[PDB]
Amino acid sequence: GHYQAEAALLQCTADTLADAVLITTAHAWQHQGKTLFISRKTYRIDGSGQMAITVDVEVASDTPHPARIGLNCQLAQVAERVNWLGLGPQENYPDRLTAACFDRWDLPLSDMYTPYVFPSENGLRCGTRELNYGPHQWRGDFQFNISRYSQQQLMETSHRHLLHAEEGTWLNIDGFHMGIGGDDSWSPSVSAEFQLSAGRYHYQLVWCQK
Amino acid sequence: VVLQRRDWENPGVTQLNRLAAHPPFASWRNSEEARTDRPSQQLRSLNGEWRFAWFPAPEAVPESWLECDLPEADTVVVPSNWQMHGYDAPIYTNVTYPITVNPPFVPTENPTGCYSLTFNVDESWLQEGQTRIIFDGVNSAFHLWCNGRWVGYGQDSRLPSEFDLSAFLRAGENRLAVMVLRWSDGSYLEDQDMWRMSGIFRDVSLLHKPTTQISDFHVATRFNDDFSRAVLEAEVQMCGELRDYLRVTVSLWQGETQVASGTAPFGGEIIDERGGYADRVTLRLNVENPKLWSAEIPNLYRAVVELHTADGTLIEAEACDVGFREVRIENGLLLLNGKPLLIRGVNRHEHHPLHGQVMDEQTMVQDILLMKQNNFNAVRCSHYPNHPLWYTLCDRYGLYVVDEANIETHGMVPMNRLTDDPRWLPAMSERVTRMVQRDRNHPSVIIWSLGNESGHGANHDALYRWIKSVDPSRPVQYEGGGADTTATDIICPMYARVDEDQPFPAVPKWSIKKWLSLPGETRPLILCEYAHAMGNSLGGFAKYWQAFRQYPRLQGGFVWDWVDQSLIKYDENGNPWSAYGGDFGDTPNDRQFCMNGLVFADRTPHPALTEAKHQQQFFQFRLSGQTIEVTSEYLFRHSDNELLHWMVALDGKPLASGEVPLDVAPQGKQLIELPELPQPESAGQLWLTVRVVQPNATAWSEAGHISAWQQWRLAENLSVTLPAASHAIPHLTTSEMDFCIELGNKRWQFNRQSGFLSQMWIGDKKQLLTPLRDQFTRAPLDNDIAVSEATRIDPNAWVERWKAAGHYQAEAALLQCTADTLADAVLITTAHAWQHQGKTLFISRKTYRIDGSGQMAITVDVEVASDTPHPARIGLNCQLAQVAERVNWLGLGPQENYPDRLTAACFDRWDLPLSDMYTPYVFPSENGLRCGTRELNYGPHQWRGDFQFNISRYSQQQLMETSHRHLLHAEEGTWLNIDGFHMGIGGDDSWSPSVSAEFQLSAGRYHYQLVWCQK
Ligand SMILES: OC[C@H]1O[C@@H](OC[C@H]2O[C@@H](O)[C@H](O)[C@@H](O)[C@@H]2O)[C@H](O)[C@@H](O)[C@H]1O
Ligand SMILES: [Mg+2]
Ligand SMILES: [Mg+2]
Ligand SMILES: [Mg+2]
Ligand SMILES: [Mg+2]
Ligand code: NA
Ligand code: NA
Ligand code: NA
Ligand code: NA
Ligand code: NA
C-alpha cells in the first residue's frame, strides 16, 4: 500500500523563539491499520529568512524497503536554468553515479528530464549540496530531480509523447533514494547496500531566497 | 671429547647413539593388556623429583657431577622448564632470534641445565632383553651419561630421544646425568613466535623390550568406492635373531569383539633383484561395513600386534587405536570418507601459564572439550610435534589434526637461507621423518606439515616428496614461500583476506576467492592461519564463513590462535598477575604479541570465542513466512541428539515459545512450520530466536548444550500513539555563566563557557563527576596499534594516523550556546569545533530538549573533515557519580560485541553485574561495548535510542595509559561511553590496518539521538 497510503497528522505545534519561529510536525502513513512510515519534522524560520527543515523518518522493518525518503512539491515558478553544486552533469543514481563529477553545473530545465520512451522516475542528481532554481536555493546533502512532470503523471503514462508539461515545476528532494539495479530487468536486482533498509533516517534542508 | 667436539654447534650432528623413531610402544607381555590399553609393567615413568643445577655455560660444569650429586643442586619436579622455577628468564621474541644470527654458532654464555636422577633398576630387567630410556622432550639439546659413562646426544626439542641403557645399567642404584643446553644449532630451526624456554619439559621413561622385538609397525586402511568394504594392512618389522618358528599375529577388535585376525611367519614379498625384507611381514585383514572414523563420529577399532612362536608362546605385544578413514584430494577438494571437509580449525600451542611448555592430561582434555563445545573440528600443531597424548585424545574425542615438523627459521634473511641450503637438509629431514615415523598410525592426523615460516627452499621440495612416497594416505601442506609452492597439496595462506588483495612482492596474499581461480590453479584453499585473535579482535569473522560456505574449494582455516601465551608473576603480597614479553627482564622482546588467544591462559573465554562458535555452527537456518528451514552441515551423522527451541518476544517480553525435535540427514534439510502467532497488543519489534539444544550428554558436552542459534526480525508495529501531555513545565534560569533548568527535585546545569551539560541534580545529589562531552577516540586496541615486532611502526596503523592528526589532543572550542523557552519544554542549542593546530577535525551540533516529564532529548549532528583519518567512534561520555550493581539493557548481548563482531550476539533484555561489562584483556584497551542497544538502565538512569555503549569504572584515558590489567584502579563513579557510531575492531591481522571499509566511520556527517530520563 505504498502508492495508496495517506498522511495522517499526529502533531502540529508552533513556538516563538528568541530570533526564530519553530514549527514541529509528526505524520503517520497507514494502509489497512498498518503504520508504514512515520515522519517527524522541525521547521525553523529565523531572522535572516532561511528556513531550516530537519526530517527524521521511521520505516517499519517488515514493510518493503521504500523507493525514496524525501519531500516533493509543485513550485509556481517555471525558470529557464537549473544550477547545482553536486554530481553531474548527467542523470545519476546511487548505484550509477561513478561517471558523474562533483562540480558546479548549469543546465536548461529540459536537460533535467530524461525522455525514456517508457516514462518513469528520471533525471535524479545525487550528492548535491546546493540547488538553485529561480529565486529559490536549497542547501544540505540530498538527491533531487526537477521537471514539469509529476511522479504521478510519469506513473500513469506509457509513452513519452503523451506527457504534457504541468503548471509550474515539480521538485523532488530526497534525503535518500533506492538504487535502480539492472543486473537483469525481470527479477529484483537492486543490491542490498543500495536498498533503504536502515529503519531510521535523517536529513536536513535549508530553504532560502537568492 | 664432549667439550672438544661441540656437537651443539654442528648442524651435521643432530644426535649420537640415538635409537630409531617408531610409533608408541609399551612392550606388553600380556595380549589382553595390549587390547584394553592397560598400563604396562615394561614401561616405567621416571617423572617426579630430580636434582638440578644451573650453569652459565657447559665449560662451567664440574666433572664430579658425572659421578655424584652436587650439594649445591636443588630438588625439582620433572618434566619442567627451568625458567618456570626461576633459574633464568624466559624470553619472548617473535621473529628476531633470541641469539646472534651466526649459524651454526651459539653464544658462549649458553645456559646449561644439569639434571640428575638416582633410581632403582631390578636385575630381571638386565638379565635379558633391552632396557632403553626415553626423553619425550628436551629443549634444546643434551648429552646423556649413565653411572658416569657417556651414552649419547640428541637434538629436536619436540620429538622423543631414545637410548639403549642395557650395557650401562647395574642392578640396584643407578644415576643419570643429563646436560641440557638452552642453545644449539637446532635453535636455528626453532624460531617459533613463542616464549623461549628450555629443559626436560616432557615425560621421561624406561622401556623394556625383549632382544627379539617388534621394532616398527604401520597401519593402513584402504576402501572400495562406497566405503562398504575395507582392507586393513599392517606392516610389522622386527629386530633380533630371525627364527623359522617366529610369527606375527595382527587382530582387529570392535569393543570386545574380534572382527578379524591374521597370522604369518616373517618374510616380505620380493621387492627387487636382491629379494625382500626377511625381517618384515605384512598382514592383510578384510573388514566388511567398517564403522568409519571422523570428528563427527570418532569410531575406533583396536589393532593388536603380537610377536610369538608357532606353538603359541607370546614374546611381546604392541597395539594402537585404528580409525577407518580415507583422506584424499580429488578434483580440487579435500575429501574425508568421500565427503568435502569444512575445516573449523584453530592453531594451538602447548602453553600453560604456571608450567610454561609442560603439558598435562587435564589441560589437554579441557582444551579439547572447549574446542568441541565451540564448534571446532580441527587443530593445527603450531609449530612442532605435540606431546604424544594429544594425538590419542584427538583420536578418541574426534578432531582433525595437522601434525607439523619442528622447523621454523623465521628470523633468517631471507627466510629460506637455511632451507635452501643442502648443508641443513640432514637436520631438517630428521624433524620431518621422525615425526612421520612416530605419528603415522594416528587416525586424527589427516595432514602433514613441513613446518612454519621458513621460506621455500629446495630442502622443502625434497622432504615433501619423501612424505608423499612413504605415506600416500595424507596430503602434505606448507605455507612458506607464498602458500602455493610446489611443496604443498593445499593452498594454505596465513591472513589472506576474503575480498581484499595484499600484493606483496614475491609472496602476495591474494583475496582467497581470487586465489582459487588464478590461471592454472586447481588446489583447495585452507588457511593455515586467519582471524588473528589478539585482544579485542575477530572483527570480520563472519565474512570468512560466508565465503567458506559459498565457495566449494574454500574449505576453511585455522584461527590464530587458541590460548594467550601469558605467564604468571606475583606481586609483593603473593597475588598472581598475567605477564607478557618484557616482564621477566627479557630483552629485546615483543611485548604483548604472545597473547593472541580465543581464551585466556587459564582457559577463561575471550568474547571472540562466542563469535567463533556461532559462525562455525553445523546447522544453517532460513525463514520464509511461517517456515523455518534447517540445513545440516554434517557429512556423516544424522541429528540424533538435537532439538530446536523457538521463542518469539516483543522487545524482550516472551510471547510464544515451543520445541520441535530435529531429524535431519547429513547435508539434508528439515522444514518446521511455526503455529499461528498471536498479534501483540503493544507497539514494538517482534523477534524470533531459535536455538539447537543437545538433550543428552556426550563425551564432550553436558546435557542441554546449545550448539547453534539464530534470530530474525518479525512484524514490527510502529508507535503512533503520542504520550499523554504532561502538565508540568520546566523553568529556565539564565545567568552569565550558566543555563539552569528546574523541574521539581530535578536540575540540569549547562555551563555557558564550555557548552556542555556540566551537572545534573536529583534533589541535592550530584549525578555527574565529569561533564557530558563528545568523544571521538578510543583507548587503542591491539589491532589499532598494529605492531608484530616492537621495533617496527607502521605509519598507516590507525593509532598512528589518529595520533598524527591530533585526535587524542583535540581541544573543544565553543561556537554557539543558546537557550529557548517552548510551550512545554526548554531547548538548549550548542555547537563545538574540535581543532588541532588550526585545523578543524570535527564539528558537533546539539539540541537538548527538556520537557515536563523530565526527559532530556539529545540530538547530535556531527561533521567529520573528509581528510582527517576516520575516527574510532562518534559519541558522548561522562563520569557518573553512581556506582550500581547491575547493568540492564535491551540490545545485543549478553557478551561484548562490536560492529564487525556482533553476529553471535542476540537482541534481548539482558541483565548483568557491572563487572561483566568490562572485558579484562591482559593489555587494556577499549572493551565491553554492546551494540544495537535501544534502552540502557543503570541505577536511577535510563537512556533510550539506537546506540552502542560501554560502562565501567575505567576511563578511556586510564585504559590508554595502562599496560597491564592488574595495574587498573576503579575510578570514582562510573564511566559511560554512549556511541551513535563505533568503528570496526578488525583482526584479519594485527600488524597493519585491518578494519574493512564498510566498518570505518567515513560518511562525513552523522546523526544520532538519545533520551536521558530518570527510571
Ligand atoms: O601472532 C602472529 C602469528 O602469525 C604468524 O606470522 C607472524 C607474523 O609476524 C610478523 O612479524 C610478520 O610481519 C608477518 O609476516 C607474520 O605474518 C605465525 O605463523 C604465528 O606463529 C604467529 O607468529
Ligand atoms: Mg569516481
Ligand atoms: Mg648439532
Ligand atoms: Mg614466526
Ligand atoms: Mg590415565
Ligand atoms: Na510510466
Ligand atoms: Na567451501
Ligand atoms: Na604472536
Ligand atoms: Na534429534
Ligand atoms: Na592500554
Q: At what angle do helices B608-615 and B541-550 cross, to 10 degrees?
A: 10
CA B846 vs CA B673, B830, B854, B858: distances in Å: 49, 5, 18, 7
**B718 interfacial to chain A (CB closer than 8 Å):** yes
Polymer length of chain B: 1015
State this model's resolution in angstroms: 2.2
Q: Record the cell numbers describing residue B951, joined without a space.
A: 560502562
Per CATH, is B211-325 categorized as 3.40.50.1460? no
At A20 the three-state DSSP class reads strand
Centroid of ligand 2 to alpha carbon of A122 (angstroms): 21
Give the β-pairing of B738-742 and B731-734.
Answer: antiparallel
**Residue B466 assigned as binding residue:** no
Per CATH, is B617-722 categorized as 2.60.40.10? yes
Nearest CA-CA distance, residue A155 and chain B, Å: 29
CA B870, distance to chain mean position in Å, is 30
Same fold yes or no, B211-325 and B617-722: yes
Q: What fold is seen in the domain B326-616?
A: TIM Barrel (3.20.20)
Measure the CA angle with vertex B330, ends B324 and B335; round to 5°.
40
DSSP summary character for residue B485? S
**Residue A186 assigned as binding residue:** yes
Of A18, A22, A141, the CB nearest to B1005: A141
- Beta-bridged to residue B131, according to DSSP, are B208
Give the β-pairing of B343-347 and B378-380.
Answer: parallel
Spatial CA neighbour of B559 closest among B483, B484, B601, B613: B613
B453 belongs to the catalytic site? yes
DSSP summary character for residue A133? E
Nearest residue by C-alpha to atom 20 in ligand 1: B193
**B847 interfacial to chain A (CB closer than 8 Å):** no
CATH number among 1.10.390.10, 3.40.50.300, 2.70.98.10, 3.40.50.2300, domain B723-1015: 2.70.98.10
Cell 610389522, located at residue = B236
At A7 the three-state DSSP class reads strand
At A144 the three-state DSSP class reads strand
Phi/psi of residue B960, each to 5°? -65, -30
B596 Cβ inside 6 Å of ligand 1: yes
Do B716 and A204 lie within an 8 Å CB cutoff?
Answer: no
Given the residues B316, B453, B800, B935, the one annotated as active site: B453
Given the residues B316, B529, B611, B935, the one annotated as active site: B529
Do A18 and B720 lie within an 8 Å CB cutoff?
Answer: no
B529 belongs to the catalytic site? yes
What is the identity of the amino acid at B784?
D
Which ligand is closest in space to the CA of residue B494? 1
Spatial CA neighbour of B562 closest among B532, B526, B527, B528: B532
Number of neighbours of residue B325 by Cβ within 10 angstroms: 23
**B1003 interfacial to chain A (CB closer than 8 Å):** no
Which ligand is closest in space to the CA of residue B341? 7
Number of neighbours of residue B821 by Cβ within 10 angstroms: 17
Q: Record the cell numbers describing residue B947, joined without a space.
A: 546506540
Which ligand is closest in space to the CA of residue A149? 6
At B761 the three-state DSSP class reads strand
Centroid of ligand 9 to alpha carbon of B289 (angstroms): 25
Which technique was the structure solved with, according to the deposited record? X-ray
Residues 6 or more apart whose CB falls under 8 angstroms from that of B491 comprise B483, B484, B515, B516, B521, B523, B524, B525, B526
Helices (H) and strands (E) in chain B, counts: 13, 60
Number of neighbours of residue B501 by Cβ within 10 angstroms: 13
Question: DSSP states of B652-707 as a string?
Answer: TEEEEEEEEE----TT-EEEEEPPPPPPPSS-EEEEEEEEEEE-S--SS--TTEEE
Residues 6 or more apart whose CB falls under 8 angstroms from that of B709 comprise B614, B617, B689, B690, B691, B692, B906
Gaps in chain A (C to N distance exceeding 2.5 A) after:
none
How far is the C-alpha of B753 from the C-alpha of B460, rounded, in Å?
Answer: 70
Give the β-pairing of B48-55 and B327-330.
Answer: unpaired
Q: Record the cell numbers describing residue B277, joined without a space.
A: 625384507
What is the identity of the amino acid at B13?
V
Which CATH architecture fits B1-210?
Answer: Sandwich (2.60)
Residues 6 or more apart whose CB falls under 8 angstroms from that of B87 comprise B52, B54, B111, B113
For CA atoms B43, B48, B51, B53, give the dihedral sign. Answer: positive
B584 Cβ inside 6 Å of ligand 1: no
Polymer length of chain A: 210
Q: How many CB pairs under 8 A join A and B?
A: 38
How far is the C-alpha of B407 from the C-alpha of B391, rounded, in Å?
Answer: 19
Q: Residue A192: list chain B partners with CB under 8 A.
A: none
Q: Record the cell numbers describing residue B106, joined without a space.
A: 651459539
Which residues of chain B from 785 to 844 reach within 8 Å of chain A, CB to CB?
818, 820, 822-823, 827
B751 Cβ inside 6 Å of ligand 1: no
How far is the C-alpha of B357 from the C-alpha of B563, rounded, in Å?
Answer: 12
| Beta carbons of B478 and B449 less than 8 angstroms apart | yes
Q: Where are the domains of chain B?
A: 1-210, 211-325, 326-616, 617-722, 723-1015
Return the best residue to mutate from B92, B193, B509 for the ligand 1 pocket (most ligand atoms within 8 A of CB).
B193
How far is the C-alpha of B706 from the C-alpha of B374, rounded, in Å?
Answer: 10
Atom index in ligand 1 nearest the CA of residue B788 equals: 11
Do B1005 and A28 lie within an 8 Å CB cutoff?
Answer: no
**Residue B593 assigned as binding residue:** yes
CA B692, distance to chain mean position in Å, is 25
B1006 Cβ inside 6 Å of ligand 1: no
Q: Record the cell numbers describing residue A201, joined without a space.
A: 533516517
- Beta-bridged to residue B209, according to DSSP, are B130
Nearest residue by C-alpha to atom 9 in ligand 1: B788
B95 Cβ inside 6 Å of ligand 1: yes
